[model samples]
Target chain A: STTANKERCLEMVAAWNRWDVSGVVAHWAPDVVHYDDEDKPVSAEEVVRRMNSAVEAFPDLRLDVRSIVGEGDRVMLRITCSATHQGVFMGIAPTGRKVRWTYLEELRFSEAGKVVEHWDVFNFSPLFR
Target chain B: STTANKERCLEMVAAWNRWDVSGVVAHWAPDVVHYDDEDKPVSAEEVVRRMNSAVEAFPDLRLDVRSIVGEGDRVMLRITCSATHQGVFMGIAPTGRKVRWTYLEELRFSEAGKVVEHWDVFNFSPLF
Candidate 1:
C-alpha cells in the first residue's frame, strides 16, 4: 500500500514537471487547505492559480524530487526546482538567470485518494538573494 | 493500525510531559537524525541531552498535541507547548512567566517502529 502511494506521489511530481497545473490540482480535493512557509492558510483556488502563474513565468521550470516518504495518509516530498525567470515574480522584473529553490511539502490524502491538506516549507530568501 | 500508531505517539508525548528524556530517546532508533527549526542537523546525543536539560529547567513543561496524521512511514504532528522557565535558556536568565510556542515535527519510522529521522519546526524568537 505504501509502495503504491509512493508511486502515485512520484506521478504527481511528473505532472508538476510537465507544468500541468490543472493536472496537479486534479489530484487535490476542492476544499484542500494549504499552509505556506509563513504558516498562512491558502485556499485551493489560490494555490492552483498561483502555481499556474508561476509556471507561466518559468516555462522551463523543472523539479527534482529528492525523496518521497509516507506512513498511512500523509506524504512528504523533498524537492528542488530550477528554472529561468522569463517573467516577473514578486514585483521584480525577469532577470532571465537560472534560479533554484529547495522546499518540502506535506500532503494529506483523504480516503478517496485526493489530497485534502498541504503544508509547504520553502526557503524564499534565496529567491531574492 | 492507525489508531495504534496514534496511541504510541501520544504515549511518547506523555514521556516528554513527564520529563523522561531517556524514555523518549528509547523510542528513537540508534541512528536517529534530527533537524532543528533552522534545518541544522543535531546528533541524537545532543538532542537527548538538550531535551533533558530543558525539562529539568522547565519542570512544569507541558505539551498539547493538536493533531497527528500519517500515511505509511511518516507522521506529522501539530503541537503547542507551554512552560515556565526556572533555568537559563539561550543565555537568558529564568523568566518565571509562562511562555507558549507552537511547532511541528515530522517523524519517519523504521520498519522496527523506531524513529529513524525527525524534522522539528519550532519558533525560537519568543524564547528570549
Candidate 2:
C-alpha cells in the first residue's frame, strides 16, 4: 500500500534528520541507484559520500519531508533542507550564510519493499546566486 | 491502468512544448485546483497566466517527462525543462542566460479522467 510506503519513506526522512547515512541506507537495496539531475546512474556509495560531504558542510543541516505523495511502490517527497554554511561546499568556502532549499526526491521500492532507485531534483543555481 | 495515466501525462508534455495553454487545460477539469510553492490555491486562469508569463520570458521553453509514476487516479511527473532567459521574469530583466530547471508535479485525476488537482514544486529562488 502507498500508506506503508509513505511510512517507510518517513523513516528514511528521520534518518536523514539524524545524519544517519547508514540508517537511511538501510531503507535501500544493496544495488540502489540514485540520480540527481544527471544522466548517469550513481551507486549507493556515491550517494553516501555526497551525504557525508553535505553533513560536513552543514553540520546543523535539517531535512523536513514537508509534503509527500506517492503510489504503490513509489514515493515523492518535498524535502525542505536548511542550514548555515559553516563549512565549504565544492570549491567555494562557506559564507556563514543560511541557505534553505527545497528538494523533490522520488524513490522506487523493490519487491522486498526496499528502496532501489532514487531520483532527486535539486537546483543549486539559485542558492549561490 | 497506470499506463493510461502516463499517456495522458505525455500528451501534456507535448502540449506544453507547443505552448498551447488550452491544450494543457483540456486535460484538466474546470474545478481543478493548482498549487505551486505558495500556500494559496490558484485557479485554472491563474495557472494559464503564470504559464503565459513563463512563455513570454522564455519563448523556447521545453519540458520533458524524465519519469512518471502513478497508481489509480494520481500521477506524479518528474520533469526537466530548459529555456533561455531572453525576456523579463518575475520583474527581473532578461539575463539572456540559459536556465534549466527540474519540476516535480503531481496531478490528481477526476472520475471523468480529467485532471482535478495539480501540485507543482518549482521554487524560483534561483532564477529571481
Candidate 3:
C-alpha cells in the first residue's frame, strides 16, 4: 500500500509525449506484458510501439493523471489523455480539434525492478469529443 | 493475503449509500478508528454522524469502485465518488454542482478480527 513504481507511471506520461522509447520502459521489463481491454496479453514493447502510432493521429499529446492507487505489487491510476488532432485518426480526417478522455490503468511490477504486467481501460469514444 | 475482506469492502460501499449503519461497520470493530483529511480520530458514533452529514449534502452519494488491492492485513482501494451537491458541504453552500474525485483509502486489521483502523487521501479542494 505504498511507493512510486506507481509514481513512475506519472513519468511514463511524459515519455508518451516526448516519444522516448527508453523513457517508456524505464520501469518495465524486457519481456514485460500488457493486457488490452479484451484482456489479451501483449508485450510492453508493442504497447510502446502502439503509442507511437497513436501520436501520429494527435501530434501534440499529453497525459494528465488524476490520482493513483498503489498496493503491494499493483498500482492503478485515473488519467486524462489530452491532445490536438492534426492527422487522420481511425479513418476520421484531421479535424484540428483539441480533445481529451479519461482512462484507467492497472499495473503489476517486479519487486524493485521492472514492471512485468500492465492493463489499460480508456473511454476512446470520449476521445471523439 | 486475505481476499475475503475485499468482498467485505464492496458491501461496505453499498452499505454507505443504504445508510445502514450496522452494515457500514459490519466488518469493523467496536473500537474502530478512521482518519480523514483532518487527520483526527473518529469513533463508531462520530463515523455515523459524519456519514449522516455527508448524506445530507449529497443524498445520492456513491462510490464507483475502481480497483482494490492488498495482501497481509493492509488493504487499499481507488474509488471515484460521484455526487450532486444539494446541501451544506465543507462549509460551502450548495452550488447544485455535480462533483467527482478519486479517493484512496487504506485499512488495517492487523492482529484483529475486524478492520481496526483506516485512513484516506483525496482532493478536498475539488469538493470545496
Interface RMSD of 3: 8.5
Chain B TM-score in each of the candidates: 0.90, 0.91, 0.85
For this target, which candidate reaches the highest lDDT against the unseen true structure? 2
Worst 10 residues of 2 chain A by lDDT: A120-129
Binned by DockQ into CAPRI classes (incorrect, acceptable, medium, high), candidate 2 is acceptable
| TM-score of each candidate structure, all chains considered together | 0.61, 0.74, 0.54
Pairs clashing in candidate 3?
A: A4-A7, B1-B71, B1-B72
lDDT of 3 by residue, B1-128 (tens): 45766766778888876756568777887778896444578776777787777888888787887678765676667677888998897688888989866666667775654888886655443454
Q: Is candidate 1 or candidate 2 better by TM-score?
A: 2
In order, what lDDT does every prediction score? Answer: 0.74, 0.79, 0.71
RMSD list, candidates in order: 5.3, 4.0, 10.1
Q: What lDDT does candidate 3 reach at residue A115? A: 78
Better of 2 and 3 by DockQ: 2
- In candidate 3 chain B, what residue range of length 10 has the lowest lDDT sum? B119-128
True contacts kept of each: 0.16, 0.32, 0.14
Report, to 2 decimal places, the DockQ of model 2.
0.35
**Stretches > 4 Å off in candidate 2:** B1-11, B26-49, B56-62, B71-74, B82-101, B108-117, B123-128
